[PDB]
Amino acid sequence: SGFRKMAFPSGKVEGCMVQVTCGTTTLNGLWLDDVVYCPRHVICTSEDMLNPNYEDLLIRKSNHNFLVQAGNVQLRVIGHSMQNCVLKLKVDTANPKTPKYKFVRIQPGQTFSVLACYNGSPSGVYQCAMRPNFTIKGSFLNGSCGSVGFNIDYDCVSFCYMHHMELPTGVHAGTDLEGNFYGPFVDRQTAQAAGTDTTITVNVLAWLYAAVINGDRWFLNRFTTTLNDFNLVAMKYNYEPLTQDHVDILGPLSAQTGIAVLDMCASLKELLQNGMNGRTILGSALLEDEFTPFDVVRQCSGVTFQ
Amino acid sequence: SGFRKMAFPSGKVEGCMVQVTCGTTTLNGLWLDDVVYCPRHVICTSEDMLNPNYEDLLIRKSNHNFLVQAGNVQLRVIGHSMQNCVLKLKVDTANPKTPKYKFVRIQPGQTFSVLACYNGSPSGVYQCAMRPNFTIKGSFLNGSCGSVGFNIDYDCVSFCYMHHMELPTGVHAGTDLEGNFYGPFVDRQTAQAAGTDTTITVNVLAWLYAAVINGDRWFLNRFTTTLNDFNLVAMKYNYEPLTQDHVDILGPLSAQTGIAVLDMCASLKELLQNGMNGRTILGSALLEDEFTPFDVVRQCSGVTFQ
Ligand SMILES: O=c1[nH]c(=O)n([C@H]2CCCO2)cc1F
Ligand SMILES: O=c1[nH]c(=O)n([C@H]2CCCO2)cc1F
């Protein structure tokens, strides 16, 4: 019945996006209860970003210097503090659209939806993964900082990402909602290079299961393998090593399809060694690694959010 | 700065989704003002779908047979009528979350976002295109009928698609919001085959412009071509013929990049004739055709919706 790169419905998060301006700089904030979260680099000018001393720059800012606007209405800022790389602006009004929510720090390999925003206004929604090198491959222009990534379980939004930086190579870095960067990145305009962009093996396997469920089966073969043998191949192709935990996580998709995990690993092994020979899998000409096992079960089972 | 398959924010549409049950069949409806729109096959049993006489089946239905539920609240049905392949259920309460909206019948080659829903509850959002054969390549399970596709211009939702049918080949067919199918498809479980899935040439060119803007430039070459020469190649590869209207639509992306449209056509020609030689463009190993010129400008310029 089809398999698409699918984001979570964005309405619960749209209702939390605001605009934050400090001096000359405008970016997005996230309004939950009576706190607005935004990147701490809102206080910087373009020149400040080369070598910013955030504590010193913040001394010169007062509550009334943070202009916070939710659509056309202005919010009153009654306190401010810095937590790691985020600012928390306490406002005098709780967001009436605050969904049930949690702050989660995700693991590399996990996926989430991004609501790209500008001037506090949502522009679009797309699905991302936290890469093993702790970058994300997003779509962010100037003004998009403070846009967030999130997952939804039924009625609860788990926020996991806030956007802060574009590296010189065009990939993206940011923090969790406690303001701690993913990976080694810092909010300074400096030479920061990403490490190896390794492929998320367990996700590729999940997507191959999704393909079989939908009738793209040409890559199934007569072979099997072992974890250690497979991983010799994973290593050569800059794939994450597959572990027994990963095998266990794939158990449900294995049970539903009747294809043993290690047999699917043998299919992936052949695909890595031989390529796809000009064929496609679920409309892709490369091996997709930004669907988790949970994403596949969810999309193949129609789980909804209330 | 990155280029992603991006859907519109879904919140305005989430607020319109309801559940409609008639007898044993449950699917989704769209609640705008005091009307709920849903597929007319809600009145059918599984057996009825082989040879349904909708007018005869509807004679046996009254207002109280259509159970309409918006979240946990029940809506009172005060009238019903069939328009083409949709039912319009008049309810006694206008949807307080009705956004500004229009009904549009899109052209093949145009893109839109789908809010996949089950039992009236949103599951996910993704971007689709109306294919030249009038199918869409979606992700729809049993229960997803009545999910809608839409575009947003600033504050106005233009609804263009309602989901009705999965063909035996796994692609999807549906109607506009006046209930007229796209293409030749009918709401009957019969032998319906899609025609040739031609590639949307103007969209491929737009995406190549997007690639250049983002620094994927390896496919630029020293050549040019003409519309007629290019189209000889398009035809061989089952690409839509490129017209002067398409060239004109690409004008802005041509102006911004300084790459003449026909020079980009020569790049595409070489890509069609030689393939990508194991390289990628914007993270894809095939030529992507579900971004329109407007989608590229929008995403590259950060247009937002209020
Ligand atoms: O840190 C937190 N504080 C909160 O008050 N909530 C409540 C507020 C609404 C739903 O959850 C959640 C958190 F994660
Ligand atoms: O057919 C239509 N009828 C309407 O009342 N509207 C109004 C109602 C809210 C915004 O638009 C739009 C239509 F497209």
Side-chain angles (χ1 to χ4, degrees), chain A residues 108-109 130-134 196-205 227 230-243 246 268 272 289:
Chain A
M130 184 56 55
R131 304 306 307 172
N133 65 7
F134 299 96
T196 299
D197 201 5
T198 64
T199 302
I200 309 153
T201 309
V202 66
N203 285 6
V204 177
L205 288 165
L227 262 192
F230 177 80
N231 279 337
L232 287 185
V233 179
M235 191 157 280
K236 169 172 167 116
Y237 290 94
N238 295 331
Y239 269 55
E240 290 293 270
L242 199 68
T243 70
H246 294 144
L268 174 52
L272 290 172
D289 78 342

Side-chain angles (χ1 to χ4, degrees), chain B residues 49-79:
Chain B
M49 293 304 301
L50 323 172
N51 193 197
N53 185 309
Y54 283 99
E55 207 73 68
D56 288 343
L57 287 171
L58 196 59
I59 282 173
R60 316 289 158 200
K61 301 301 179 185
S62 301
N63 289 335
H64 69 270
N65 295 128
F66 297 96
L67 301 181
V68 181
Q69 199 176 317
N72 200 230
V73 81
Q74 206 72 18
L75 303 186
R76 191 174 296 275
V77 178
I78 58 166

Side-chain angles (χ1 to χ4, degrees), chain A residues 1-2 4 6-7 9-11 14 121-126 137-141 166 172 283 286 290 299-300 303-305, chain B residues 1-2 4 6-7 9-11 14 121-126 137-141 166 172 283 286 290 299-300 303-305:
Chain A
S1 71
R4 273 274 187 194
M6 181 173 303
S10 64
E14 293 170 47
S121 290
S123 181
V125 66
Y126 52 87
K137 295 191 171 126
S139 171
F140 292 113
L141 296 175
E166 185 167 75
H172 300 116
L286 50 74
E290 300 199 346
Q299 184 176 161
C300 292
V303 173
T304 50
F305 312 94
Chain B
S1 71
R4 273 274 187 194
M6 181 173 303
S10 64
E14 293 170 47
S121 290
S123 181
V125 66
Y126 52 87
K137 295 191 171 126
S139 171
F140 292 113
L141 296 175
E166 185 167 75
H172 300 116
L286 50 74
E290 300 199 346
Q299 184 176 161
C300 292
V303 173
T304 50
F305 312 94

Side-chain angles (χ1 to χ4, degrees), chain A residues 116 118 122-124 139 141, chain B residues 1-9 110-113 127-128 150-154 206 210 213 252-253 256 290-305:
Chain A
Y118 296 89
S123 181
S139 171
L141 296 175
Chain B
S1 71
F3 202 76
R4 273 274 187 194
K5 192 61 74 53
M6 181 173 303
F8 287 105
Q110 284 308 287
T111 57
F112 58 94
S113 300
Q127 191 75 352
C128 282
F150 60 97
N151 284 275
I152 305 181
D153 191 89
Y154 287 65
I213 289 158
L253 287 169
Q256 185 194 329
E290 300 199 346
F291 297 98
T292 64
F294 196 7
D295 294 339
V296 175
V297 170
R298 264 215 311 292
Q299 184 176 161
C300 292
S301 89
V303 173
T304 50
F305 312 94

Side-chain angles (χ1 to χ4, degrees), chain A residues 92-214:
Chain A
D92 79 349
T93 299
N95 181 358
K97 304 179 196 169
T98 301
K100 296 189 190 165
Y101 74 92
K102 288 172 166 54
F103 288 173
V104 169
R105 185 177 178 81
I106 56 168
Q107 291 301 125
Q110 284 308 287
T111 57
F112 58 94
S113 300
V114 171
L115 183 63
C117 293
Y118 296 89
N119 298 121
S121 290
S123 181
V125 66
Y126 52 87
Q127 191 75 352
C128 282
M130 184 56 55
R131 304 306 307 172
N133 65 7
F134 299 96
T135 66
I136 73 173
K137 295 191 171 126
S139 171
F140 292 113
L141 296 175
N142 281 348
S144 62
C145 292
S147 297
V148 297
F150 60 97
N151 284 275
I152 305 181
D153 191 89
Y154 287 65
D155 59 347
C156 177
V157 183
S158 288
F159 295 102
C160 58
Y161 180 82
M162 178 170 275
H163 184 52
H164 289 241
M165 303 293 277
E166 185 167 75
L167 304 175
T169 46
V171 302
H172 300 116
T175 68
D176 64 18
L177 268 293
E178 301 184 340
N180 288 306
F181 269 88
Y182 289 98
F185 304 110
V186 295
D187 46 359
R188 176 187 341 132
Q189 204 179 303
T190 196
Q192 315 191 62
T196 299
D197 201 5
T198 64
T199 302
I200 309 153
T201 309
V202 66
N203 285 6
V204 177
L205 288 165
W207 168 84
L208 290 177
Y209 278 108
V212 170
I213 289 158
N214 287 276

